[PDB]
Amino acid sequence: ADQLTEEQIAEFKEAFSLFDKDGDGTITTKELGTVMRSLGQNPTEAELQDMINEVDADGNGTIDFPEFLTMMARKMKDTDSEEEIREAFRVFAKDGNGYISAAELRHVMTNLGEKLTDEEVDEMIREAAIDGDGQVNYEEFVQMMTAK
Template sequence: MSQLSEEEIADYQEAFNTFDTDGSGSISRSELRSLLTTIGQKRNAKGLQDLLEEADVDKSGTISFPEFLTLIDRLVKNKSSTTNFSKDELASLKESFDHVDRDSNGSINTTELRSLLRLVGEKFDKAFVNSTLQEFDTNKDQQIDFDEFLVMANKLIKNKSN
């Protein structure tokens, strides 16, 4: 984990306390869902459970403050290391993602991915759509969440510029 200043730790403690709505001193599954939605990282049920299990090092079923710090550090590093998008580009990509996510569940299935690829101006066969899904679906839930979508967009943009 990267070194945090006292001010950053205080800010994270305040955020932790805000999402610890029952005052238990830890963040439950439902509180984690609320937190992720607030920061624009909506996950489906499996993605949420996987993230909780990954963050919950002591296997208590909830996330303590030290576990929360590690989780936030990982989420921030993951986002900044996989993409180099500006705020405006991220907003535009989020808008595109939300437009294609017709059922508003926070992820894109194969049908929605096919629609997205058509928006790019290409018509791809089912095999290409399925292989694209497999390539970018890092948590293997058969859907592309927004973080996975950013990695996909980053790669597509790099490929176009080469």
């Protein structure tokens, strides 16, 4: 009802606090704009009040948890899942290439400027330890998206 299986809720849960500064249990525009900007879009002031307008949950410039994703959930309905995953990589990959690093986890959140500790990431870093090196390119980055 509120919390599902770890990886099932893993995205919208964590992406629940992404926007929610106030968190009346909804998502506001001032948040949705602070979000988008980190993906490489035109930083507009109305973009957030506009983005919640068409995907209006409450229409007071607030979007709920089942609506914000309705577009990625749409990619679940539509078979456009093949051409998006490579551009969805570009989201973080501003280098147009992408290299193997488990440290990437810390660059995505700091791309927004999130604050984490050395031990927080020592676990989030070890939560991705591969072969014994600890780096991960587009292989695990896309698989992160392709896997449910």
